[PDB]
Structure formats: C-alpha cells, structure tokens
Symmetry: D2
Amino acid sequence: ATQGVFTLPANTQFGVTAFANSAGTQTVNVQVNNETVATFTGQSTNNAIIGSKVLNSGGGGKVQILVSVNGRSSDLVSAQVILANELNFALVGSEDSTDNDYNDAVVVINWPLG
Amino acid sequence: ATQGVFTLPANTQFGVTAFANSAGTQTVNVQVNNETVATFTGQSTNNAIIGSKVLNSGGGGKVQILVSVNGRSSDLVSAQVILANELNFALVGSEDSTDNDYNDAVVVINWPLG
Amino acid sequence: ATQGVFTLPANTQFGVTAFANSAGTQTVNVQVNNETVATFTGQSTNNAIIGSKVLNSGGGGKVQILVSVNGRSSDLVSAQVILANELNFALVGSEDSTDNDYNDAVVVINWPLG
Amino acid sequence: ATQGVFTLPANTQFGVTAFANSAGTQTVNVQVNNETVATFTGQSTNNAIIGSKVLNSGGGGKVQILVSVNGRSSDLVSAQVILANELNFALVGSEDSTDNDYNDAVVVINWPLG
Ligand SMILES: CC(=O)N[C@H]1[C@H](O[C@@H]2[C@@H](O)[C@H](O)O[C@H](CO)[C@@H]2O)O[C@H](CO)[C@@H](O[C@@H]2O[C@H](CO)[C@H](O)[C@H](O)[C@H]2O)[C@@H]1O[C@@H]1O[C@@H](C)[C@@H](O)[C@@H](O)[C@@H]1O
Ligand SMILES: CC(=O)N[C@H]1[C@H](O[C@@H]2[C@@H](O)[C@H](O)O[C@H](CO)[C@@H]2O)O[C@H](CO)[C@@H](O[C@@H]2O[C@H](CO)[C@H](O)[C@H](O)[C@H]2O)[C@@H]1O[C@@H]1O[C@@H](C)[C@@H](O)[C@@H](O)[C@@H]1O
Ligand SMILES: CC(=O)N[C@H]1[C@H](O[C@@H]2[C@@H](O)[C@H](O)O[C@H](CO)[C@@H]2O)O[C@H](CO)[C@@H](O[C@@H]2O[C@H](CO)[C@H](O)[C@H](O)[C@H]2O)[C@@H]1O[C@@H]1O[C@@H](C)[C@@H](O)[C@@H](O)[C@@H]1O
Ligand SMILES: CC(=O)N[C@H]1[C@H](O[C@@H]2[C@@H](O)[C@H](O)O[C@H](CO)[C@@H]2O)O[C@H](CO)[C@@H](O[C@@H]2O[C@H](CO)[C@H](O)[C@H](O)[C@H]2O)[C@@H]1O[C@@H]1O[C@@H](C)[C@@H](O)[C@@H](O)[C@@H]1O
Ligand SMILES: [Ca+2]
Ligand SMILES: [Ca+2]
Ligand SMILES: [Ca+2]
Ligand SMILES: [Ca+2]
Ligand SMILES: [Ca+2]
Ligand SMILES: [Ca+2]
Ligand SMILES: [Ca+2]
Ligand SMILES: [Ca+2]
C-alpha cells in the first residue's frame, strides 16, 4: 500500500516533527497538495529532532511524507489515530536498511493546533 | 480508565516530546516506575516544543505522563500504536478547559531509538 | 474524557460488532445521531460475538456506544485508527468491575463497507 | 514493510474475526508460530463475518494473517493499537483489486480474553 499520505481537513493548521535514529543523514520531504513545503535534513542515532514546523493543509488537505537517504527512498509505514474524537496524529516510520527498526526517520503530524 | 500510563520494554531508551497549544502554561511531568524523572514547562498557541528528552524505562518499564496548568490537573487521553510490529508510539492529549480540543499539551513517546 | 463517541463520515454504511468477555451479561446500546438504532445483549467469557449489524451514519455521522451490565454503566475507553488513509476502525473497550481488563464488552466499528 | 505479522504475548488466548467486503471470495489464513491454525473463506459485499475463532499465541507469540482471493495474494495493511495499557487490537486491511478501499477482507485480532 502507499504509506505516508494523509487527508487532513481543508485549511487546517498542523504540526510536523521529525526525529532521526540512523547512521545515515535523513531527508524528510513534506508535500501539501502535491507541492513541497518543507524539507528536514539531519543525522542522529539518539532521536534528535531534525525539524518541526507549522503548516496549513490548504484546499485539498493532502499531506504526504517522503523519506530518503541521499535520494534513495526509505520504506515507509504509517497510520492515523484519533483520540477524544478530536485529537489527530498521523504517524510515519521509515527504514533505510535491513534491520527493520523503522525508526531511521520518525515523523509525527498533529492537529488541531491552537 | 486511567490514561497516560504505558508499559514499555524494560531498561529501554525512549524519546519523550511535548508540544503546547493553549493560553495556559503547561507543566508536563514524566514518571518512570513511579518516580518523576523529567518536567517540561512552557507556553504556546502554535505547537511549540516545550521539551524533548531521552530517558530509560528502568526495571518495570512503567511510564506515566501527567499534565497540569498552574497546578490544576488537565484531563488526559492516550493510546499506544505499533507499526511494522516494531515501531512504537505512546500518545497523550490533554484538555485544560471546555473546548475539548485535547491539544493543550500533546505528548509523544517513541521507541526504539538508535 | 467522554469515550465511545465517534464522528463518522456522513451517510456512510458501517459495521458494528460486539464481543463479550465477562461473567456478566453485557448490554451494548448503539446510538446514531442520538437515537438508539441497535441493542446487543449476550454473555460469554470466551469472546463470543453478541451482535454484528450494518448501520448507516446518517446526516450528522454521530455514533455513540454505551455499555451496561444489569443496570450499571461500564467504564469505557476508545480510539479511532485509520489504515492506508482509507480503512477506519472505531474501537471501544469496557469495564464492568475492578480487574481493569477492559474487555468485558469489546465493540469494533468498521468502514467503509462494500 | 511486511504487514499482517504481530508479536502477541506468548502463550495467550486471543480472538480472530474476519469480515468480507468484495465481489471476490476471500480466503484468510491464520498462522501461529509459522503453522496454519485457521482458515476462513467467504464472500460478502455487506461486511459478513466469514470466521471468528479463539486461538492461543503459543511459545513464540507470532501471529500472521495472509489473505488471498482465488489464489492471488491481496495487498495488506496493519497496525496494533493498545487502549488503557491493557486492551489490544491487531488490525489488518486487504485489497484484492485497484480501488484501494482495503476492506476486501478485514481482520480483527483482540486480547486479552476472558
Ligand atoms: C543509511 C545507513 O546508515 N544504513 C546502515 C549502513 O548502510 C550504509 C548504506 O546506506 C550506504 O549506502 O552504504 C554504506 C557503505 O558504504 C552502508 O552499508 O550500514 C551501517 C553499518 O552496517 C548500518 O549501521 C549499523 O546498523 C546495525 C543494525 O543493522 C547496528 O545498529 C550497527 O551498530 C550499525 O553500525 C546502517 O544502519 C542504520 O544506522 C544504524 C545505526 C541503525 O540505526 C540502523 O537502524 C540504520 O538503518
Ligand atoms: C488554561 C486556559 O488558558 N484555559 C482557557 C482560559 O481559562 C481560564 C481559566 O483557566 C482560569 O482559571 O479562569 C480564566 C477566566 O478567569 C479562564 O476561564 O480561558 C481562555 C479565554 O476564554 C481560553 O482561551 C480561549 O479559548 C477559546 C476556545 O474555548 C478560544 O480559542 C479563544 O480564542 C481563547 O481565547 C483558554 O483556553 C485555552 O487556550 C485557548 C487559546 C485554546 O488553546 C484552548 O483549547 C485552551 O483550552
Ligand atoms: C459483571 C461481573 O460479572 N463482574 C464480576 C462479578 O461481579 C458480580 C457483580 O457485578 C454482581 O453485582 O454481584 C455478583 C455477586 O452476586 C458479583 O459480585 O464477580 C465475579 C466474581 O468475583 C467476577 O468474576 C471474577 O473476576 C475475577 C477477576 O476480577 C476472575 O476472572 C475470576 O475468575 C472471576 O470469577 C466478575 O468479573 C467479570 O467477569 C470475569 C469472568 C472477568 O471477565 C472480569 O474481567 C469481569 O469484569
Ligand atoms: C476480487 C474482485 O472481485 N475484484 C474486482 C473485480 O476484479 C476481477 C478480477 O479479480 C478478475 O481476476 O478479473 C475480472 C475480469 O475478468 C475482474 O476484473 O472486478 C469487479 C468488477 O469491476 C470489481 O467490482 C467492482 O468494483 C468497483 C470499484 O472498483 C465498484 O465497487 C463496482 O460496483 C464493483 O462491481 C471487483 O472489486 C472488488 O469487489 C467490489 C464489489 C469492491 O468491494 C472492491 O473493493 C473489490 O476490490
Ligand atoms: Ca533501520
Ligand atoms: Ca535505526
Ligand atoms: Ca483546550
Ligand atoms: Ca488548545
Ligand atoms: Ca473486567
Ligand atoms: Ca473480562
Ligand atoms: Ca478493494
Ligand atoms: Ca471492497
């Protein structure tokens, strides 16, 4: 299945935060309605935050996360969870290698904000 | 039900990150096996990160999140999600008022690291 | 927090299935936009299915699950999870006593259908 | 990532239930520690339960779900969610065609029982 693609409500502010846990430098691309609106880059084996931004979901509400290590696409896994019928998390794990820890870049999207 | 309480694997390094979305200054307490090991304090209405730390789960693996605003406990909601049978998120939302956005402090716990 | 309340997409077919794991006979009330549309009653300590029905979320999309055992409301816990940005589960656990297994009646709501 | 594979607690009773939503007859294979222990077959476009069983996770706790339609493997998506630090769901969607509703066979695994 395609992973890392989420439909948010239109015109909604959301947070995106990425963490790194790999020898490789991670590149996290964030697309909103098919345009790149943020790129986070960094390297850590101890969960450093390599980027955190507030974005708007725009007209279509489509948010897509892509992860690469020097242009090689990582394998992704994702899901969305809703608490209290209101608080949303869109979650991505990624794997750059063969150990299948899926933490090499971890991306958390949250809404609503404010 | 009790919310904000999670069993991690024993003696395991994990990440904890807190975001704020409220007029009120948020105080986030992290307990590991019933002892306070970290406290985050901050204020934002735009999802600012008010703390991020790496901790060890200790003998029992018990991690509890508590959130208060000027000493008044917020109402919590939580769940744990596991992706690819490996990547774990323990998720907390909190509500300091009556609008029930449950984002007033948002806490994300992730493991494994490295 | 209030639990067991979900906003589904409007006018959508959905499944609701209930499982029992308790000495006590479970009564599961399903409301759609604030009207009772199904009641499931049954007893099992081995996960028997005490009801499964197809319902429609109607104009407001509001779905609420309530559980009681011989006239006592059970304590609820709930969340919603979305896979492949499409497959939705709304999940309820309930507790009729003090052991906190939260499985005494388990309710699974799934959509889309067809 | 491999999907539909879960590590349950070892030696634990669990429920497995499958629903069908497709023109195609679904075949759901349940393996426990690499051995087939249940097969559910059926056809519905209205969420009929095509099987529900109680199983034990055995020494390794490994549970794998596989889905095929007339011998062709469906594409799987899965996650595990935990409520109240106690109630577990392992969730599987599958897609037998190109519409990506991922509901063609839906499989719910729940524990603890009793
Ligand atoms: C992206 C990366 O760092 N992956 C692997 C690393 O793989 C790189 C390739 O990506 C690159 O293209 O070629 C080089 C050789 O020129 C290399 O193969 O390989 C290292 C070393 O094997 C591996 O780190 C080791 O991972 C094992 C677990 O499999 C173990 O942790 C060991 O201690 C590490 O040294 C990289 O794996 C990534 O980083 C690790 C630190 C760990 O976080 C893994 O989960 C990552 O996938
Ligand atoms: C902790 C906090 O700031 N909560 C409310 C705030 O509540 C305070 C009480 O905590 C205090 O004890 O008493 C005072 C009055 O004496 C007050 O009731 O009230 C403010 C103003 O109403 C409220 O912010 C408003 O929230 C609404 C939505 O309900 C809306 O966003 C408006 O723009 C706000 O000004 C505080 O609500 C929190 O902060 C908001 C910005 C929002 O993030 C809410 O979700 C928070 O719960
Ligand atoms: C609803 C129910 O069956 N609850 C308890 C049960 O409680 C009932 C009261 O609800 C009723 O008001 O009074 C009767 C006496 O007339 C009784 O107190 O009590 C039984 C017996 O204690 C209890 O089952 C036992 O539960 C323990 C775990 O706490 C353990 O499994 C033991 O083997 C059981 O015999 C009922 O608990 C429920 O059913 C259990 C089988 C189990 O599924 C629990 O999770 C349930 O909550
Ligand atoms: C397994 C199955 O029934 N899949 C499709 C079905 O696909 C079959 C192939 O599996 C087979 O190998 O080849 C034949 C041609 O010989 C055929 O292509 O095709 C039917 C008809 O198109 C399709 O049902 C239709 O699906 C659309 C949406 O794409 C819509 O619901 C329409 O009303 C259906 O008639 C099968 O799709 C499956 O069943 C549907 C009812 C639906 O539940 C889909 O999600 C399923 O994937
Ligand atoms: Ca890796
Ligand atoms: Ca790693
Ligand atoms: Ca609030
Ligand atoms: Ca707020
Ligand atoms: Ca109980
Ligand atoms: Ca029980
Ligand atoms: Ca399909
Ligand atoms: Ca279908």
